Write an enzyme that holds these catalytic residues in place. Sequence first.
Site, PDB file in Angstrom:
ATOM      1  N   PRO A   1       0.862  -1.178   0.000  1.00  0.00           N
ATOM      2  CA  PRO A   1       0.000   0.000   0.000  1.00  0.00           C
ATOM      3  C   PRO A   1       0.900   1.230   0.000  1.00  0.00           C
ATOM      4  O   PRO A   1       1.686   1.435   0.925  1.00  0.00           O
ATOM      5  CB  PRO A   1      -0.813  -0.138   1.278  1.00  0.00           C
TER       6      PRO A   1
ATOM      7  N   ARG B   1      12.716  13.580   8.512  1.00  0.00           N
ATOM      8  CA  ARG B   1      13.962  13.540   7.700  1.00  0.00           C
ATOM      9  C   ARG B   1      14.909  14.687   8.064  1.00  0.00           C
ATOM     10  O   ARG B   1      14.445  15.764   8.448  1.00  0.00           O
ATOM     11  CB  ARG B   1      13.616  13.598   6.211  1.00  0.00           C
TER      12      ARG B   1
ATOM     13  N   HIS C   1       7.999   0.164   6.816  1.00  0.00           N
ATOM     14  CA  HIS C   1       7.425   1.135   5.858  1.00  0.00           C
ATOM     15  C   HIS C   1       8.505   1.697   4.987  1.00  0.00           C
ATOM     16  O   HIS C   1       8.475   2.897   4.671  1.00  0.00           O
ATOM     17  CB  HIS C   1       6.567   2.196   6.558  1.00  0.00           C
TER      18      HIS C   1
ATOM     19  N   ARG D   1      10.572   4.735   6.464  1.00  0.00           N
ATOM     20  CA  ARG D   1       9.966   6.097   6.400  1.00  0.00           C
ATOM     21  C   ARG D   1       9.537   6.566   7.774  1.00  0.00           C
ATOM     22  O   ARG D   1       8.948   7.654   7.834  1.00  0.00           O
ATOM     23  CB  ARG D   1       8.766   6.067   5.454  1.00  0.00           C
TER      24      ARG D   1
ATOM     25  N   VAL E   1      12.961  -4.952  -0.545  1.00  0.00           N
ATOM     26  CA  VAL E   1      13.049  -6.001  -1.600  1.00  0.00           C
ATOM     27  C   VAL E   1      13.415  -5.374  -2.955  1.00  0.00           C
ATOM     28  O   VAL E   1      12.623  -4.539  -3.430  1.00  0.00           O
ATOM     29  CB  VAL E   1      11.762  -6.805  -1.671  1.00  0.00           C
TER      30      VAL E   1
HETATM   31  C1  LIG Z   1       5.980   6.900  -1.271  1.00  0.00           C
HETATM   32  C2  LIG Z   1       5.549   5.889  -0.235  1.00  0.00           C
HETATM   33  C3  LIG Z   1       4.346   6.013   0.386  1.00  0.00           C
HETATM   34  C4  LIG Z   1       3.867   5.054   1.293  1.00  0.00           C
HETATM   35  N1  LIG Z   1       2.590   5.176   1.775  1.00  0.00           N
HETATM   36  C5  LIG Z   1       2.136   4.218   2.584  1.00  0.00           C
HETATM   37  C6  LIG Z   1       0.819   4.172   2.976  1.00  0.00           C
HETATM   38  O1  LIG Z   1      -0.040   4.978   2.499  1.00  0.00           O
HETATM   39  N2  LIG Z   1       0.385   3.119   3.734  1.00  0.00           N
HETATM   40  C7  LIG Z   1       1.250   2.162   4.219  1.00  0.00           C
HETATM   41  O2  LIG Z   1       0.796   1.260   4.966  1.00  0.00           O
HETATM   42  N3  LIG Z   1       2.537   2.180   3.855  1.00  0.00           N
HETATM   43  C8  LIG Z   1       2.961   3.139   3.049  1.00  0.00           C
HETATM   44  N4  LIG Z   1       4.244   3.070   2.558  1.00  0.00           N
HETATM   45  C9  LIG Z   1       5.092   1.895   2.875  1.00  0.00           C
HETATM   46  C10 LIG Z   1       4.914   0.769   1.857  1.00  0.00           C
HETATM   47  O3  LIG Z   1       3.685   0.060   2.093  1.00  0.00           O
HETATM   48  C11 LIG Z   1       6.012  -0.277   1.970  1.00  0.00           C
HETATM   49  O4  LIG Z   1       6.090  -0.774   3.361  1.00  0.00           O
HETATM   50  C12 LIG Z   1       7.381   0.177   1.570  1.00  0.00           C
HETATM   51  O5  LIG Z   1       7.257   0.835   0.282  1.00  0.00           O
HETATM   52  C13 LIG Z   1       8.392  -0.942   1.427  1.00  0.00           C
HETATM   53  O6  LIG Z   1       9.743  -0.502   1.284  1.00  0.00           O
HETATM   54  P1  LIG Z   1      10.448  -0.473  -0.164  1.00  0.00           P
HETATM   55  O7  LIG Z   1       9.463   0.131  -1.064  1.00  0.00           O
HETATM   56  O8  LIG Z   1      11.681   0.287   0.007  1.00  0.00           O
HETATM   57  O9  LIG Z   1      10.860  -1.934  -0.476  1.00  0.00           O
HETATM   58  C14 LIG Z   1       4.717   3.983   1.638  1.00  0.00           C
HETATM   59  C15 LIG Z   1       5.966   3.900   1.046  1.00  0.00           C
HETATM   60  C16 LIG Z   1       6.374   4.795   0.085  1.00  0.00           C
HETATM   61  C17 LIG Z   1       7.726   4.622  -0.552  1.00  0.00           C
END
Ligand SMILES: Cc1cc2nc3c(=O)[nH]c(=O)nc-3n(C[C@H](O)[C@H](O)[C@H](O)COP(=O)(O)O)c2cc1C
EC number: 1.1.3.-
Lengths: 368, 352
Positions: free
Chosen positions: B87, B172, B243, B246, B277
Amino acid sequence: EYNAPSEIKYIDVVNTYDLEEEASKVVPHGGFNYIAGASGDEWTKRANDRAWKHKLLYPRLAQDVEAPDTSTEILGHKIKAPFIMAPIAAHGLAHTTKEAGTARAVSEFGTIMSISAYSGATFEEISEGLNGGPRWFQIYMAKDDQQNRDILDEAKSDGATAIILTADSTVSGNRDRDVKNKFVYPFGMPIVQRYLRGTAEGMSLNNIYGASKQKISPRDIEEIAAHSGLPVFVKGIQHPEDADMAIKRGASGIWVSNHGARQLYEAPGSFDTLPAIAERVNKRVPIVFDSGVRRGEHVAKALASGADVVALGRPVLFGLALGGWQGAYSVLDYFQKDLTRVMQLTGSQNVEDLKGLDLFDNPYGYEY
Amino acid sequence: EYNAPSEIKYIDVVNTYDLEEEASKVVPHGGFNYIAGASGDEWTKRANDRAWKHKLLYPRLAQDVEAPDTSTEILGHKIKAPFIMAPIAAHGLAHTTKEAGTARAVSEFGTIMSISAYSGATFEEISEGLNGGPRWFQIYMAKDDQQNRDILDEAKSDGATAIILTADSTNRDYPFGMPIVQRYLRGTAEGMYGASKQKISPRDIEEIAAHSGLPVFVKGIQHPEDADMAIKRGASGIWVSNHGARQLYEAPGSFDTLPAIAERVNKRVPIVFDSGVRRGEHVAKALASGADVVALGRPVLFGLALGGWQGAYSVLDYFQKDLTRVMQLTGSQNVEDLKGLDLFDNPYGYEY
Ligand SMILES: Cc1cc2nc3c(=O)[nH]c(=O)nc-3n(C[C@H](O)[C@H](O)[C@H](O)COP(=O)(O)O)c2cc1C
Ligand SMILES: Cc1cc2nc3c(=O)[nH]c(=O)nc-3n(C[C@H](O)[C@H](O)[C@H](O)COP(=O)(O)O)c2cc1C
């Protein structure tokens, strides 16, 4: 002839270790030593027992309000507690009602009966005690493919819902009781004699034991898994690579066992081998654990370490000696009640919560 | 206004790392840094990447004659390969076709789409892209019980087959709205972040699990005791995640947390793993370490920026093909064989 106990009664099971000495008073000496003994000087049977002190339970706060529930499911079958009956030859050495007695206890309690290929009872006798209860059939791998076809057909005819392929045989076990006591079985093997009659393999106990491969291979597993039409558990696994090879060959389950320390001497206690196997299995197939389960705490530790269920062996046969089906039922009831107490103290409401327990690593072992 | 890329094309994905720098050339700077960035000085994002070198794959002899098959199933859903879409908010920062584009890629490939609480597309736009394909809905825990009942009813009526309860909200050293949250945050000024709890409790998990009518995954688990408490509170899945680095800074790389969680979960519920991943080898290592599937995030969004649904599809195709090669070299014929791999413990870490 052989004077087995015949009394049927409930017994007040306070612990399963005392059942051994109580059974030694009512079971003829040769039969008792066949059941109780193990390989070598029984160091690996003692290791089975002592291994439980290597990983200790923590009492934990509860996180749910409901009464503990011991029920679980394996291969889609709902059972009253996370334990089944292990396949054990010759229940008539313990009691005149033999495998029918044990089957009645297991079916009345609400779990799965495992039938040894070396049952002293006909399937018709066992069926009387089972009364529709679920059953799994244990086989050895015959050197002659026709004999494997024969026993797989027997199992299907008898309503088996799984095969237990034991990885080890020809009455092995350097120094239980055959090299020392000089005791030979007082009865037959009617399940295998049904199909061995008129072959050389049926002519004597030595020829029956000798009809089996002494150790199975992955090719053997593949052949049984391909032709059984049933899920196949491979029993006797103690090494994780063997578990992986067995699953790749078509096993539908891994049964972690050293057969109650009756085969290889100067091997680990079975519980010490379980976590490495469970980590390699990694949820691919169900795990049955046995060899040394004596207490509810042992059932809990096996679940916490990756088993789906445990199998019970000697304590159920000692119960059968002491009270027939009611005595064997008393032992199943003991395990279920003790497991409920352990669930309460570990903050566990159900069998899934037991799978989540953290264990304390005891590096000092038994003498602490 | 915000000039997101709009081109639709397949792309030759040779590795996912190069997608970031390629996407940086086509995505507006603000939107790109939102997507690529992470907390603090990005040490824990680098940890997510470097953690893969802690456990190394062995090449192994084969024990089966069949070509590798990547198919698997989760919650009874058969999928092409053991990865799903994570997501992610605001896909329109990456491409004008936004979440509809990603949904088309995921449905065309044959896996599960996760829909963020903060989607820029309406459910109708996403639904057209999904064309019936399976979808899971990600939610935050509302302070208002009735807002939670309403999003859960909406998710199930929109054909969601699971709920993803994200344990954390926002670190950040946003030029368009959120039609799906604004579709029940009109009337009072919560759509004008303060509407959601910053951190969930076991009681929150219990409330969602009891009222959803769907399996609930708890996302953001990094500690085994939290996995146990979540399952006891009624979670139907554990989603191991930081996440994408983040949220919490100076935390472990996500992959380093996975084995302890998987051992505590001990098969009770399925595990989704994410955060870092980037290669087929990573999918194999996660499965060998107890995950049922992984979730893909940033690489799929970079693909979306570069080619819309076809670019995102190209990234999914790369992961499937790369995984097939890893299976051949590890002697794995299927995804269950991957779950059985032995990994080499590397105590030297990245510099070896
Ligand atoms: C731009 C961005 C926005 C994200 N927004 C959400 C979110 O709305 N809900 C959520 O559960 N995780 C959010 N995530 C986390 C992603 O679900 C996921 O855990 C993460 O992208 C995995 O790390 P990776 O993309 O570096 O492999 C977000 C991640 C990114 C990069
Ligand atoms: C008397 C006796 C006979 C056994 N016969 C068989 C057998 O026919 N087939 C088999 O697979 N295992 C056999 N076993 C092993 C059991 O299935 C089981 O692994 C063992 O009883 C577990 O150890 P425990 O009883 O000490 O806990 C036998 C064990 C005993 C004690």
